Amino acid sequence: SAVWGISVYGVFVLGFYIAQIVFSEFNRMRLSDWISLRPDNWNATRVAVIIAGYREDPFMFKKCLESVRDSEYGNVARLICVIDGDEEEDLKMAEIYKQVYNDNVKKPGVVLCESENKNGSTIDSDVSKNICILQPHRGKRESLYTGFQLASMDPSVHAVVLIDSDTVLEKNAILEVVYPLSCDPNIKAVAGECKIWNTDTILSMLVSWRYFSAFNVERGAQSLWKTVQCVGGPLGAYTIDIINEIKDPWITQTFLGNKCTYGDNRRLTNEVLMRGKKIVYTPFAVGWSDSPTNVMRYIVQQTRWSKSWCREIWYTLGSAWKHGFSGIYLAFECMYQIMYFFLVMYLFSYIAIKADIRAQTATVLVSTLVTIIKSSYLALRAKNLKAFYFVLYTYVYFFCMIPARITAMFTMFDWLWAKQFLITYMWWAGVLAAGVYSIVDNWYFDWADIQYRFALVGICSYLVFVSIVLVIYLIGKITTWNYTPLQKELIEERYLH
């Protein structure tokens, strides 16, 4: 029962984590070996940059345009900017674009996705000059298709780069994200690493470290196995042939996601994968994007992402049960996540019901130990001392993800805030009631027993460590040490207006 569950948890989690670490290390070594053999000033591959956005801050859009203009790639054909809207408010983005780039702004009255002639020559005539499109407001997916059509009409290009309207790119991000495409002809898509620039909130730093760890281990293992699922925004690469082949199936699929938002980059990668085309991911290409600072917004978008995750894990299992020897790694990750969630729920229920101080201290101690080991590994890999803040991610995970997944599975099982936040409130109330019952049931003091002394010492040490971490974070905020160097200059530039 409990012994079997804890043993299975330990062995399976340790094996899976070791596998991810070794796979990420091997992928990094292989990528470094591939990069070390390339010649200097390599610009053989011709690529085009496509930018899509809607209701984007003009400052962030201007910074993204400047970062695109700061790229050192010497084989850039053109820049495609598509705005999902043709209203008076949407003209601010076009005006901002005219300040950073040419004034070649077009306002077609039709949408290529809903027109008989889907070719890009209907709305474009010259490919030498950069073009800006102000289409009627339809959605993010429609904007991507127009960019693909505009890039497809030029036979000179060989690949495309997809970034968000708020993405900040390094001077070598474009070259690094398109270099591995020519290394292996079987590679048709490359994923780019994404970082969070703003870290002025306790939630923002935690989600930034979570994203960094995700890109480091899961995407690294997927890159090593050449079966990457996380491909798309805010930084990615795609070859012209695969997008030309799969543009129609991607846009003809029924969409039930966010209205005029959340362009389906998941199903595009699924379409690439189901055709037997290998996909790799690189961490050298670095992209910068913002993160929400509201816990409620975080919870609701996690619920939406959990629903997505369900549909796309079914889809990717169906698509990856074709590779034969390979393709089972995604299914293994799926079962790993499902069993991890199930065992966390079972362990929490067991701890709530049995209410014994002996086992709870051991469980919290081993959880703290493994979290500290993970944080130390993250700090060693990132060469940054700020990665130790990941120990606080367990609290936000337990308090936000579990209600989000519960709501996601309840929605798809067999009043706007009732279906979004009532489940979280009930979960919090249940956790509080379980804690109160545990404290009341075990309310006693006995210093003549070593086991009680050991449990009390462990609890006191855990609380002391948590308080020390919180104090370190608080003093770091005042000294502005935790602030990203990119964030500081962005804040100064915003202050200068």
Partner: nanobody, 117 residues
Amino acid sequence: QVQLVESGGGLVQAGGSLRLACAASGRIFSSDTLAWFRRAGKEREFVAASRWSGGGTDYKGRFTFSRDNTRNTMCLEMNSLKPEDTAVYYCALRTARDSYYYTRNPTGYDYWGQGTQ
């Protein structure tokens, strides 16, 4: 937004070397194309150009292009002289906002700088 100011020159016999420096005050986004021209009684002719990020084109093997990339100061020294190379050199800038293609036509260079020699 940007202004180009040159430096160096003078009357030098065919036996010797000269160094011309073109300086800028502003942001060039590290993507604009920088070119050089020799003559202002004939039309301006191409000499040498190179992108800020990297690369370089001639028409040479005699004149090389160098960039500090930190103080926004350029340099282009000449090895050996000929009787027909004496002219008012100019510093050229091409804007990449309109297009990313590299053109030898001086007309596409909207920004111009004053000459010294």
